[PDB]
């Protein structure tokens, strides 16, 4: 066999069927989306690291990454992401 | 209809009489002051300039062709 | 009379068709030969993935597309429809090389 090589194929397919059940997906577009997930994730992770060390914080919390989102994501995209993440963390803390 | 526009060009260039030649800016605003559709008759004033330079009634001051500035001849 | 189009119209047709085009615009094999050529300028007997040839191909063409869209911005700033090398040179200077 082969070792399991990890990718974000299934979850982007899940949100794809969630928001457009009738549409399809291609392999090149899926590679683009995996690179997009990796790129945005590493940008936010890097800014979260910088916020962690500038405040001498040993941890990155929702405040840290939330601030990093306000830095990276501009404007209405930023506040919508704040709204989504706040709703998500309230649902998470509601267990 | 009316008179031909070359007469208007000659009176416009003879109205000023600067020590140097008159460029196209002062000429086109002299025609604007006299009253002329200078925006729609660029080709017409170009052929008028070619006719007046080529026939020899008017002499070019320093430019080449219709480019440059123009003065009146010796007589 | 054989039919002939005015200059720029075929050029603008190429503009529209190849902004519409999404494929690779360079012949593959001479680009592969060139990246191997530059490789043996650096390390001897070096090998490439075909996917790496694809990757340098698409990165190279997109980077050049960036330099040329800067070149149109510079050229219309220079009031020219015909670009010159100084447009690309100034774009390289401002881009932070």
């Amino acid at each position: 066999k082969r070792s399991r090589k990890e990718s974000y194929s299934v979850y982007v397919y899940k949100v794809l069927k969630q928001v457009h059940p009738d549409t399809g997906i291609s392999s090149k577009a899926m590679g683009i989306m995996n690179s997009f997930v990796n790129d945005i994730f590493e940008r936010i992770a890097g800014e979260a690291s910088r916020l962690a060390h500038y405040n001498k914080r040993s941890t990155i919390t929702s405040r840290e990454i939330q601030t990093a989102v306000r830095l990276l994501l501009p404007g209405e995209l930023a506040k919508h992401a704040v709204s989504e993440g706040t709703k998500a963390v309230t649902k998470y803390t509601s267990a | 209809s009316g008179p031909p526009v070359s007469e208007l060009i000659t009176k416009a260039v003879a109205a000023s009489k600067e020590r140097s030649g008159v460029s196209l800016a002062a000429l086109k605003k002299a025609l604007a002051a006299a009253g002329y559709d200078v925006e729609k008759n660029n080709s017409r004033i170009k052929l008028g300039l070619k006719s007046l330079v080529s026939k020899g009634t008017l002499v070019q001051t320093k430019g080449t062709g219709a480019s440059g500035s123009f003065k009146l001849n010796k007589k | 009379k054989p039919h002939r189009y005015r200059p720029g119209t075929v050029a603008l047709r190429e503009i529209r068709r190849y902004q519409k085009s999404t494929e690779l615009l360079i012949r593959k094999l001479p680009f592969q030969r060139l990246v191997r050529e530059i490789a043996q300028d650096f390390k001897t007997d070096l090998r490439f993935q075909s996917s790496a040839v694809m990757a340098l191909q698409e990165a190279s063409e997109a980077y050049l597309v960036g330099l040329f869209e800067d070149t149109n911005l510079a050229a219309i700033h220079a009031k020219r429809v015909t670009i010159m090398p100084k447009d690309i040179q100034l774009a390289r200077r401002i881009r932070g090389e």
Partner: protein
């Protein structure tokens, strides 16, 4: 064995299509040689980074992974081949 000119394999009509993508409508003859020159400069920088990766990988064949890594370092991050 060795090759001395494949820079011209990125041909004059090929550079014409590339600038047709950028919207360039008239191209004088002087542009093309400098475009291959700056193509050599950029790809030289990228492959310098890439072979430095590759020699650090202790391998002898370049993958696209270190290619997109070098494009990340230079600041022209490429989508489609990450991971």
């Amino acid at each position: 064995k060795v090759l001395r000119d494949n820079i011209q394999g990125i041909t004059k009509p090929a550079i014409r299509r590339l600038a047709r993508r950028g919207g360039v409508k008239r191209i004088s003859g002087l542009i093309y040689e400098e475009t291959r020159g700056v193509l050599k400069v950029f790809l030289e920088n990228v492959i310098r980074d890439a072979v430095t990766y590759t020699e650090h990988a202790k391998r002898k064949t370049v993958t696209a992974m270190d290619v997109v890594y070098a494009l990340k370092r230079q600041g022209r991050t490429l989508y489609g081949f990450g991971g």
